[PDB]
């Protein structure tokens, strides 16, 4: 497997020893917050650092596209006609004290999120689609009627009944049902309001993963040791340490061999890392899209709907396409990205092979000739004295709300402004300078929307169920440019329809959506990204494959 020029795995020619200590770090300038219950945890840093311990007790394995497969701590099966997901825990699934993981432990996760007495921030409207769960959530019911136990609470099977099936239910991260267990017998006598701050969920938890936390240093680190009761094979390693490292100290830590692996390293730091001997740098495509937005309307908050009613030459499809074709995204990525940005052909990255195809063509190749032709044929005619096109005596002049963030952000925006000059479009930065991130978020998300920008850039961390209703639907506040198109609405709905419970149909629906979005050009995909990870050359079995389910048990070292 390759991701760009990067290897996804480090194929160590040397065998792993039996034993050893692996030292891993996560780059963060903010402390970890240890919370072992998924429902009560809001810290992404700790969520990653929980990996050796089971990832906050995740149950389901997936393929490399995040589609559920059998063979993990539990299996999940959908039955359309029952409207039910059935979760079957393995016979051998135990907690790290040797207690059995039972059906109650899965139901208890739902209580931790849905009963407000626990203080969870993770309730979502999606959960209201489980029979009886909204009523449990609001106190109307004392149990969750939609969750049943074919073989009792102390058996291994849980049935979850829905009001409606959803096609995303075969993707991890879908949110319509949950994927973790919580140790009910261990935690049952803690008052719900005290659970999140209990030692039992912070410093001294029970877990289900290949390692268990022997010591947690608040804000900083976890020492992991083998979990005797893990259902899989014993791990190779005798211990793993997982520590927070600051951005400012990561490279030196690599120089000093303090860590074998550092995760979360940002795109900036790379050329300091890429030359360091003794490391193999692996890469993987990120769950990420960046894109260019055109401002085409406003958001009606009272009616929760985008109205595409702004006066702008960008209402013309030809103009939107031309401005897309004029960019030099590939060249910009070559010049500046250190290889960590690659041009997007579509709005969904190819991580999701079941929802994407490289056959989908977008604006990944500059085409100034096409851009100039589109504008000409739309009556935007090139003025001799100025070098800019006009229609009814008005120049084609746009405001670009480019933002701070990328290290070469200024330079990149200027690249684009210069390409746009080549097609006779005059483009200036919003107030003559880059917008700070918080100001940009405010500008884009405060209804009804501003009228003083034309072009902007946005970027998103995508969920492993990648429907984009929350980004581009007519009702979405995140639809920053406020387009509303009947064909796109039909396409978005088709992706989430009952017919899309069939994966071949859903693929086709995603592909049509991606093509239609490109053609309409209300938004223009810009880049995908690559995450990089330095790995000490002694590490054996390391891979960033999203399909690799057993890495913590398999990983080892070739020498102590």
């Amino acid at each position: 497997l390759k991701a760009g020029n990067f290897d996804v795995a480090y194929q160590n020619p040397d065998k792993a020893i039996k034993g050893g200590n692996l030292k891993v770090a996560y780059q963060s300038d903010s402390p970890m917050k240890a919370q072992w219950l998924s429902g009560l945890s809001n810290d992404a840093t700790f969520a990653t650092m929980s990996g050796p311990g089971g990832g906050q007790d995740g149950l389901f394995f997936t393929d490399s596209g995040f589609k559920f497969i059998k063979g993990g701590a539990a299996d999940v099966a959908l039955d359309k006609e029952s409207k039910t997901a059935t979760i079957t825990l393995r016979k051998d699934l135990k907690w790290s004290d040797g207690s059995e993981v039972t059906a109650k432990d899965y139901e208890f996760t739902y209580e931790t999120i849905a009963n407000p007495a626990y203080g969870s921030d993770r309730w979502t409207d999606s959960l209201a689609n489980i029979v009886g769960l909204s009523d449990y959530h609001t106190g109307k019911a004392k149990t969750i009627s939609g969750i049943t136990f074919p073989d009792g609470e102390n058996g291994k099977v849980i049935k979850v009944q829905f009001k409606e099936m959803k096609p995303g239910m075969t993707q991890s991260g879908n949110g319509y049902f949950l994927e973790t267990v919580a140790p009910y017998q261990y935690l049952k006598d803690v008052a719900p309001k005290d659970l999140a701050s209990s030692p039992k969920t912070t410093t001294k938890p029970l877990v289900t993963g290949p390692f268990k936390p022997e010591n947690v240093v608040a804000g900083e680190s976890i020492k992991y040791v083998p979990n005797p009761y893990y259902w899989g094979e014993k791990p190779k390693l005798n211990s793993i340490t997982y520590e927070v490292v600051s951005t400012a100290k990561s490279v030196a830590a690599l120089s000093s061999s303090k860590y074998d692996i550092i995760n979360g390293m940002v795109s900036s730091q790379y050329k300091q890392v890429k030359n360091l001997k003794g490391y193999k740098v692996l890469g993987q495509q990120a769950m990420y899209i960046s894109l260019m937005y055109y401002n085409l309307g406003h958001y009606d908050a009272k009616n929760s709907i985008n109205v595409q009613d702004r006066k702008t030459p960008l209402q013309d499809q030809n103009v939107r396409q031309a401005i897309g074709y004029a960019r030099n995204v590939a060249e910009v990525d070559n010049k500046f990205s250190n290889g960590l940005s690659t041009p997007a052909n579509s709005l969904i990255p190819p991580i999701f092979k079941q929802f994407t195809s490289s056959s989908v063509k977008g604006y990944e190749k500059q085409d100034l000739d096409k851009a100039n032709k589109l504008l000409d044929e739309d009556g935007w005619k090139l003025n001799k004295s100025t070098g800019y096109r006009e229609k009814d005596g008005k120049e084609l002049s746009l405001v670009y709300a480019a933002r701070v963030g990328d290290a070469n952000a200024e330079t990149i925006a200027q690249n684009y402004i210069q390409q746009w000059k080549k097609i006779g479009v005059k483009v200036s930065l919003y107030n003559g300078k880059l917008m700070e991130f918080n100001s940009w978020v405010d500008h884009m998300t405060t209804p009804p929307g501003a009228n003083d920008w034309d072009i902007t850039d946005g970027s998103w961390s995508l969920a492993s169920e990648p429907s984009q209703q929350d980004l581009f639907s007519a009702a979405a506040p995140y639809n920053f440019g406020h387009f509303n198109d009947s064909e796109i609405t039909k396409d978005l709905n088709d992706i989430d329809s009952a017919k899309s419970e069939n994966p071949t149909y859903r693929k086709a629906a995603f592909v049509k959506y991606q093509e239609d979005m490109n053609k309409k050009a209300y938004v223009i995909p810009t880049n995908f990204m690559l995450n990089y990870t330095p790995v000490n050359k002694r590490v054996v079995g390391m891979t960033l494959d999203y399909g690799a389910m057993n890495t913590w048990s398999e990983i080892g070292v070739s020498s102590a």
Binding site: S461, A463, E465, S467, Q468, L471
Partner: peptide
């Protein structure tokens, strides 16, 4: 499900 970033 998706967040700015």
């Amino acid at each position: 499900a998706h967040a700015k970033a």
